[PDB]
Design a protein around this nucleic acid. Structure first.
Lengths: 141, 152, 309, 389, 13, 50
RNA sequence: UUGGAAAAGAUUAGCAUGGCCCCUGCGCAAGGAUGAC
RNA sequence: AGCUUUGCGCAGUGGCAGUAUCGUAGCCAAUGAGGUCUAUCCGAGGCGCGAUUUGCUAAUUGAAAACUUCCCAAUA
């Protein structure tokens, strides 16, 4: 399915990041067949219209669009990238690297909170924002 | 325009392309100086590999075919399960496709015998209960009226 | 009821209270080391409260009157719920930020002399809030100016020609590896100097040498629970900086005063001359009693701990 | 709920039906597998448990709707002669006890205000202070305080509801997710909650005034469950030569649970039994309160077979219906020997005379809410006769 | 649009 | 309905007047003392009553 | 005059306007009764 | 010509304001909303959803809480 819009070349990506001025651009780098990307994209579609006011989601295929692999260290099976007014926003998830999510959370509310915090920090002017949760521990007991 | 045309700077090595064994997938000599001699060498080495596989080729291929046939017969792929309905779905007019709406909008009654048996049990219980003399009951309407009159 | 009841078998009103843990709490306090023994693990001594009898916390107060009623977002609610964890971590910092608890990862705080044993972002944020706006440098500056003022007010009484304001690099305040000079005393007559002794060493043995220029150094430290002994720290750092190669002193003879802000302690071990002992003693007393920068540090710590008297 | 799109062509509709069937099979199987994993003790996060609870909730309400429809189709499971036998047993017991039935709460009831205050205090106690209440909780608090301010109008309204009201609103349902087993939790409309609470208080007070429930029916309010265990052990130990085994005597301790006690309660027979002890209007109200709609988020069904247990007076019903089973387990003779004569009743574990205590194989009986503990003592001859049978 | 991604998914799986 | 875009305007520009009734409805003058206080030293009621 | 050096704005409180209502005055619309050789 | 009424708006005094003040794009409504009194009787909006503009001043926190080059020494 994947009703979320897709970008088929680097040109689409680099004018999609600059297209939004009052909304956070979300880019999922990965592959549809990849299950983890499947989980994240299901979560995103579950909240695609909830964050329409202040966020936008685009799906980018690594094979179709491989130019960002070296610059963004796109070596994981899947990454999630946050941009605002041409500036990347780093998120302090507690996983060691603040640039990309690199994992698929099943709860859509966690992603909603993450994108809301990113928007709040980007409109205020901070380039690095703190996640309102710690993902170092999976919280499984 | 490249990816730098956005004016951005960085802050298949993908884990998918890498396997702990065999390392990274993909031949390192996929392209290069390939000519007639290279084709001959590849043909010779492929023939050697086929000859090596000939040791158990018949039984191995027979077992593989039997195993895959039984695996497909036991567990069918979901596309195989839905192919029947997919093909039966072809017989549909294009006029009916525009008609798909949105989501905005003999025989025996099983209840009658249950109600009959329940009423029979109730009648039997009432017949037995009529022998009980000490039961108390008040007049609902009468009591209410008194309540009415009692309101200050 | 959607809340699971553990005391389903009894009612407080009908059966009464069948258990009592008041003596349990008393014995817990005694076994943990008494009230003061427990408080030694905390920042209570860092607040400089004279006594703990009349104090009280402020549960659910925060910086915004706790902002309890609102249309706040779930993430904001999580942050508000995590704020008391920040208060708890700040309270128990002296006993969990020590190297015994966490091995390795000894990273000094930015523009601050505090070392962070273990990556505790909560404590990092709390300490940054406490020491905002270069509070360490301001505290050291205030201490050095106060000591210079005290020495000038008692200049001729101890045969001191004058005092000197040494050019100090900003980092010196939070420079632990090396050190420098803070105050230089110049004399009209020779100062006979004594052998090194602690601030509490009433009896000192006189050294058979004299000097004309005398250095005074001020070192501020944030001691954890295991290393809150100010005298040992002062002695070790005096014997290190004097015989160091990246630390240059104007004279071999001088005094080094170490001040523990986390526990409000102070001690000097350097070389002393007659008449300087009481002057330095009352100077330290008055500077712990009425320093403006130290008072601001105490007030910021109290606000972070939400503890008031 | 039915799903039938009118304009959807039948091939696409059949494909959607097949897809829903396959996804439902996978959904049910994975819900059961996740429940087994969680109950076993596997490490799981919050999302998994939450999802599983939701799935299980949907599955359990599906099964409950199926059970209710099966009861409606297959009629009452209790046979007519079985029901009249139970009724005769109960009436013989109550006549033997000379039990005077509990009258309808009198308008000038001397203790009505106290019972209403107790019910309101119990209802307010259930609302632990969290400062974040939904509309239903704040509405219940408003009704509670309004009734507390003016007890008399609330009492009149409650009596009017007991006399006239027989149709009620939907009862919400939720599941306490104890990892061993889900526990039903029922949310009732606040006015109905107040009426049920007052009725429960009145019923319990009047029953304990008339000694309706025999001593063996626990949980009694005079001993915590540990004290119940202690008294049970001492009563076991205080029987005449209970530990003697020279002549082949044998003591038997049987514990049971009365499986599906709550679910398998016939509302018609329950009403007929309740009319024996309480006023017919009260009995009809109690029975009708059970036959209401149980509603989840999008799911609802008419609970017609089993009792609800979310009702405030359900605590009474279980303690009454269970007593009926006691008369089946003990028999009207032995129970009469254990409960004592109506002149002076016996205690929990006591008999008027030793000769009466050993006159029957059953020495001790103790019923919890649904569990039964029975202590028998047999001689060699009695034990071999029972084994032979 | 959706079919373009569906064909890519089916081919790769 | 989509979740409205979060924003942080100026919390308050003027005070007094109606503003006071607003807080009165929610945020009225409570005891504001000995309710959010802990009494660092001693213990109220039982030790672990909670 | 001279010489020399070079929190992306927070939080709380009060007053007035705006909002609503009685009354007053005025304007306007539509009138009501009535006085004058 | 004097006087007066209803309705309306402007201006002003006084008063009210969370059982208060509105929007409602949702629905119903004089072709009758809602009624336990007066029922062969009364006659208006009602129900759900969603809100409670602008200026000035003061105070707190903070090093700085925002209006257009500042500082140091000496004489006049």
């Amino acid at each position: 399915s994947y009703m979320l819009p897709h970008l088929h070349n680097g040109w689409q990506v680099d004018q999609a990041i600059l297209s939004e001025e009052d909304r956070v651009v979300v880019i999922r780098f990965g592959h549809d067949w990849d299950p983890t990307c499947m989980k994240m994209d299901e979560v995103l579609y579950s909240i695609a219209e909830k964050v329409k006011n202040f966020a936008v989601i685009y799906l980018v295929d690594i094979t179709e669009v491989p130019d960002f692999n070296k610059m963004y260290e796109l070596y994981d099976p899947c990454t999630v990238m946050f941009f605002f007014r041409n500036k990347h926003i780093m998120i302090d998830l507690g996983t060691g690297n603040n640039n990309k999510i690199n994992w698929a959370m099943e709860d859509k509310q966690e992603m909603v909170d993450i994108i809301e915090t990113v928007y709040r920090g980007a409109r205020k002017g901070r380039g690095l924002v703190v996640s309102p949760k710690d993902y170092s521990t999976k919280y499984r007991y | 325009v490249p990816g730098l045309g956005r004016g951005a700077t960085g802050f298949d090595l993908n884990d998918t392309n890498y396997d702990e064994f065999n390392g990274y997938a993909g031949s390192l000599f996929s392209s290069g100086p390939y000519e007639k001699d290279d084709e001959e060498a590849d043909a010779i080495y492929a023939a050697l590999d086929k000859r090596m596989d000939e040791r158990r080729k018949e039984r191995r291929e027979q077992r593989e075919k039997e195993e895959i046939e039984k695996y497909r017969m036991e567990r069918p792929k979901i596309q195989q399960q839905f192919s029947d309905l997919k093909r039966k779905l072809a017989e549909v007019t294009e006029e009916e496709w525009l008609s798909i709406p949105e989501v905005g909008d003999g025989e025996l009654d099983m209840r009658k015998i249950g109600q009959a048996r329940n009423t029979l049990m109730d009648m039997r219980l009432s017949q037995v209960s009529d022998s009980v003399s000490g039961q108390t009951v008040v007049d609902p309407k009468g009591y209410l009226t008194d309540l009415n009159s009692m309101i200050p | 009821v959607l809340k699971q009841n553990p005391f389903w078998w009894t009612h407080q009103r009908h059966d009464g209270k069948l258990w009592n843990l008041n003596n349990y709490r008393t014995d817990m306090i005694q076994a943990l080391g008494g009230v003061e023994g427990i408080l030694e693990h905390t920042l209570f001594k860092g607040t400089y409260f004279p006594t703990w009898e009349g104090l009280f916390w402020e549960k659910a107060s925060g910086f915004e009157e706790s902002m309890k009623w609102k249309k706040l977002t779930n993430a904001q609610r999580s942050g508000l719920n995590q704020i008391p964890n920040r208060r708890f971590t700040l309270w128990w910092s002296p006993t969990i930020n020590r190297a015994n608890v966490y091995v390795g990862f000894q990273v000094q705080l930015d523009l601050t002399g505090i070392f962070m044993h273990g990556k505790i972002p909560t404590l990092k944020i709390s300490l940054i809030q406490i020491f905002r706006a270069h509070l360490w440098q301001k505290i050291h500056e205030s201490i050095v100016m106060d000591l210079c003022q005290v020495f000038d007010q008692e200049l001729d009484a101890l045969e001191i020609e004058t005092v000197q304001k040494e050019t100090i690099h900003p980092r010196k305040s939070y420079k632990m590896n090396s050190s420098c000079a803070d105050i230089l005393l110049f004399a009209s007559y020779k100062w006979n100097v004594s052998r090194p002794s602690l601030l509490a060493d009433s009896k000192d043995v006189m050294d058979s040498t004299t000097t004309q220029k005398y250095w005074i150094d001020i070192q501020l430290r944030w001691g954890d629970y295991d290393s809150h002994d100010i005298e040992r720290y002062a002695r070790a750092k005096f014997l290190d900086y004097t015989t160091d190669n990246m630390s240059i002193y104007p004279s071999p003879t001088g005094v080094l005063i170490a001040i523990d802000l986390a526990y409000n302690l102070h001690s000097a071990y350097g070389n002393w001359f007659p008449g300087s002992k009481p002057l330095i003693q009352q100077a330290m007393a008055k500077i712990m009693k009425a320093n403006p920068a130290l008072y601001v540090l105490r007030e910021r710590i109290r606000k972070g701990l939400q503890l008031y008297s | 709920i039915p799903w039938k799109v009118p304009g959807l062509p039948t091939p696409i509709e059949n494909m959607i039906l097949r897809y829903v069937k396959a996804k439902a099979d996978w959904w049910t199987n994975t819900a059961h597998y996740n429940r087994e994993r969680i109950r076993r003790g596997a490490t799981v996060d919050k999302t998994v448990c939450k999802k599983n609870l939701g799935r299980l909730t949907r599955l359990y309400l599906k099964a409950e709707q199926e059970r209710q429809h099966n009861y409606l189709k297959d009629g009452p499971y209790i046979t007519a002669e079985e029901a009249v036998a139970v009724y005769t047993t109960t009436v013989h017991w109550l006549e033997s006890r000379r039990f005077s039935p509990i009258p309808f709460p009198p308008l000038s009831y001397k203790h009505d205000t106290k019972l209403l205050i107790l019910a309101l205090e119990r209802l307010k106690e259930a609302y632990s202070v969290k400062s974040r209440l939904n509309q239903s909780q704040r509405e219940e608090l408003g009704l509670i305080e309004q009734a507390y301010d003016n007890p008399h109008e609330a009492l009149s309204r409650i009596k009017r509801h007991l006399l006239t009201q027989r149709a009620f609103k939907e009862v919400g349902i939720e599941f306490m997710d104890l990892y061993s087993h889900l526990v039903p939790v029922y949310d009732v409309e606040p006015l109905e909650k107040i009426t049920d609470a007052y009725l429960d208080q009145y019923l319990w007070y009047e029953a304990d005034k008339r000694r309706l429930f025999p001593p063996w029916i626990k949980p009694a309010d005079t001993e915590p469950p540990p004290l119940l265990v202690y008294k049970w052990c001492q009563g076991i130990n205080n029987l005449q030569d209970v530990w003697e085994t020279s002549e082949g005597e044998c003591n038997v301790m049987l514990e049971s649970r009365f499986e599906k006690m709550y679910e398998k309660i016939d509302l018609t027979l329950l009403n007929r039994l309740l009319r024996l002890i309480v006023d017919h209007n009260i009995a009809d109200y109690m029975t009708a309160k059970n036959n209401v709609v149980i509603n989840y988020k999008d799911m609802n069904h008419t609970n017609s077979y089993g009792i609800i247990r979310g009702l405030q007076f359900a605590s009474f019903i279980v303690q009454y219906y269970g007593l009926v089973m006691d008369l089946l387990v003990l028999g009207l003779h032995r129970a009469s020997e254990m409960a004592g004569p109506p002149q002076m009743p016996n205690d929990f574990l006591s008999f008027q005379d030793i000769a009466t205590e050993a006159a029957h194989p059953i020495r001790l009986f103790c019923r919890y809410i649904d569990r039964i503990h029975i202590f028998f003592r047999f001689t060699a001859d009695e034990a071999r006769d029972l084994i032979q049978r | 649009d959706i079919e373009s991604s569906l064909k890519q998914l089916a081919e790769r799986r | 309905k989509p979740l409205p875009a979060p924003l942080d305007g100026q919390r308050k520009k003027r005070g007094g007047r109606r503003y006071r009734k607003m807080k009165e409805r929610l945020g009225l003058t409570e005891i504001r003392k000995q309710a959010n206080r802990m009494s660092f030293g001693e213990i109220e009621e039982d030790a672990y009553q909670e």
